[model samples]
Target chain A: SPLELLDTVPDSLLRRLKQYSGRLATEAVSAMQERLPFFADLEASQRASVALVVQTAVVNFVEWMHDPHSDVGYTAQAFELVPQDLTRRIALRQTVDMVRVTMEFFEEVVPLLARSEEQLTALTVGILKYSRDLAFTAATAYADAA
Target chain B: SPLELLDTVPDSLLRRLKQYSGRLATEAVSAMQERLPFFADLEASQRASVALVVQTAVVNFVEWMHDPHSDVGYTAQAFELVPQDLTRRIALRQTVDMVRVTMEFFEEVVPLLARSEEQLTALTVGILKYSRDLAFTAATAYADAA
Candidate 1:
């Protein structure tokens, strides 16, 4: 079955997610930079590349929420915009850390933006599923590039 | 559908597998002891527990080959013979190295014992699937224990 969990997210919550997604993406990348020494050690240009990836991921996440379907291939497609050598710079395990940081950001930030307790629960579950699919995508993308 | 790939393995190949299974199990554990410092560093008693797990795995693998069904829960059951603290001592990544060592042993030894090229190919594919399922089982077992 397709990922219908996103459908449960209310329209008001989806609008807020879309509106604040860019800011959240920035904060998520900043959170990773502060928390993961490996990410913090990257050069400015490389860090910018990572920020680009994160921003695109947030946008894709919002878009996917608007239309939940079985085509998880789109999640992997987001990585195609980056340089082929980017994968060598960021190993899959490092990407795992990146996901952990991003999900932590979501956990801390999304609740504040929720309109109700029910919406908060829905967003939390939806973000959990998103992170899982994204982690799977990152692993597949790295393997394919390798 | 169930894992019918094992069903492709001929009766003659199964006989050969059963005959050499114990030797294969011993060599596989030896391969891990030699190749992985983590396994070599384990105390004798702890290493013996690991060897017992491997031996049971080999036996269960042979049994599963004789009956290719969807009941993969039995795969996780093989780990129950070990001490409860075994997972704390051996991380999942260490188990991954153990699996790699065992599969490498299979690649090297199974061909030598194979009766024909066709049997060799059959055994190779069957071993590949077995390793994958075993890896999944090891992951689930470790996660459940954690």
Candidate 2:
């Protein structure tokens, strides 16, 4: 189960995650700016918030690796970073793609941070778990948005 | 309106936010560990995940400052960091307080990050806006969780 995968994630892996997470966030959002049309087209004034959105996901991911139990409010707390009006503007479906884009970035990048098979397995499973969570979270947010 | 505040947030204040955001995330989660019993009593293994929970919120806020339009999936995107089992473990109500705690941290720390009256106003209004979104996001999460 994804739960087991989360619980067993090791410290060595987490350390590597901590070391590289800053870059992961910066790079991930930068990737989003390029790959996601909505993000790419955003006005300079409004782009900072989107950057923060992805950056928040990257950092939150590292934290989730350390303790699986605190995962309850991860998505809810994340959304609290922005204002309500913005939520009204962007469709929930586009947000799903945003997550998909970020997850794709992680798939490519997370492997470099892995040292051993143990860490690699943990990293892989962790992303799988998070992506699933992200999917559900999107569903929840849209449901609630209505 | 909150929408107007999101548009006009100044670059000088954004620069200040960039400088101190690392400290803001660290201190905010640290405060939660001390102030919120749920976070404090966790075993060391699980505590790191909780730390990530708060840290993610901090980074997300900074990004939101840049682009208000990307706000659509903020809360949903944040939740994607953790596994589903963990969400089941913590009540939606407790999650509300977690956000409340973090917001309280912002109310205190954000003022220090402000340089002028304009930035201070933006910070105040920004926090207020995010909190409202958070409340709605929490409601959404619980609704979807079921």
Candidate 3:
């Protein structure tokens, strides 16, 4: 059914999205090593710093994805974890680029996620029928969402 | 806050984990391709299969990170996924060695994911504040946990 066609995003965009996400992820990691002191240290304090840095990054990235303009007035209020100079230089622009690329990617992958819901549901049911753990079932459901 | 710094896990161990995980992912993808008859039909399906394989590998790798015993079990699972002929030729001890080698690569790269999380969080917060999305608040809360 043509209607089913609507369920999957075009393949081209999905590929780009995956590639872009992977690249962005890689670049961000590289930047952290170069810019963040906490990440560079090999001590306990460094671990805590790294955790703070990572948590901050995840929050910011999610926010950017949902809305781009919000970044203009963004402030880090949660912890004292401020962005380093290097981070400030590239973080905003890179994030915007991340969102743009992700949006372009999602334009294609969204359909696949939507359309595959049925397949995932069936797989879940099969797993459950075999008496698999509810936790595993829940996890798969979450993965399906991703 | 200077707390007791338990010795950092050795770089060699981290290297082993990464190498093992990568091999697990690669082998799983190969196994998936061999086992799934329908994968040969399209490029998209193959790509999706690879994604799923990689995802599974990560999931399994994380599990092993939390428990060394899991690696022993995963070894059996890996063999089960491969053809019997190949399994017969490859020594079990050698397979474990291969897993160790593969995980070394993952150890090298896993830190990158941590780094990206930081940058991504900054971007997200900016976007949220701009859009004034209530979801941004909730998203930020989640990011804090990450």
Candidate 4:
């Protein structure tokens, strides 16, 4: 199974990945701001809404990567942190842009923690899936709020 | 209260908008093929899937414009035609992009139907809201599938 490659990442590294995600998420939000024009337009709380999305996305990426096939409900987990009606001000494109920014950040950093190319490859693939689902989750949340 | 503009749109205009949407959807799909690089890459049916989304959007736009403040469930209705997992090939950004194209089309079209600036503003606002919810719905469907 492809998930077997994840085993090569080692448990200690997984813990560190989760541990480092806290700061990674903060950096990601700042990156999102640099990448998107609309970031500064968000009020502080609304801006935090964006950070929560990134933070939860990284958290979800870790959980989902651990068990890609599990029914652990990362969908709900990713979307739950941000309020639904937030889309009234910001658009879903921003969500996609945020995810792309996060993905870029993770792609660069996740590989740094990898012991081998297989583990890095697995994390890359896992993060791609997470990005798609996270964008979908953001849209779903906004749709629900709408 | 502002939904009163719908009253001016009249019964015949509603029918025309619906009928015209059917035609415009076809035209828009053609335009989408010309406008987007990804459009031609989709299989015929998948491309039609995009068309179905557009058609349903226009149909939903008509239905919502008839009752902006109504209890109509356009959120569920907007994406009711497509397979949920379809977003695997096409992401929400594409959905949002296609919508931006469609809105550009509608923004130019709706003003023609307006008898006054207020009605034009109302219809414009209503369409933007519809576009937002539709993108959100597409995202939700993808999330549910994920």
The ten-residue window of minimal lDDT in model 2 chain B covers: B72-81
Relative to the real complex, the DockQ score for model 4 comes to: 0.02
Lowest summed lDDT window (length 10), candidate 1 chain B: B1-10
Using Cα atoms, each model's DockQ against the true complex is 0.03, 0.02, 0.01, 0.02
True lDDT of residue A94, candidate 1: 64
Off by over 4 Å in 1: A1-8, A72-76, A79-81, A144-146, B1-146
Q: Is the docking of candidate 3 incorrect, acceptable, medium or high quality?
A: incorrect
lDDT, residue B24, candidate 2: 71
Misplaced by over 4 Å in model 4 are: A73-75, A78-84, A136-146, B1-146
lDDT of 1: 0.60
TM-score of 1: 0.46
Stretches of model 2 off by over 4 angstroms after superposition: A1-8, A70-75, A78-81, B1-146
Candidate number with the higher lDDT (1 or 3)? 1
- Candidate 4, after superposition: displacement of residue A55 in Å? 1.5
> Can you list the residue pairs that collide in candidate 4?
none
The local lDDT score (0 to 100) that residue A113 gets in candidate 3 is: 30
Better of 2 and 4 by TM-score: 4
Tens-place lDDT digits, model 4, residues A18-90: 7887688788778778887887677787777667666766666777776665476435544533456435544
Candidate 2, B30-119: lDDT as tens digits: 888888888776566555666665666666666777775555535444543366665447654455556667776775676456666445
Candidate 1 per-residue lDDT over residues A68-132, each given as its tens digit: 56386255445533566545555645655666677657655765666664454445445544554
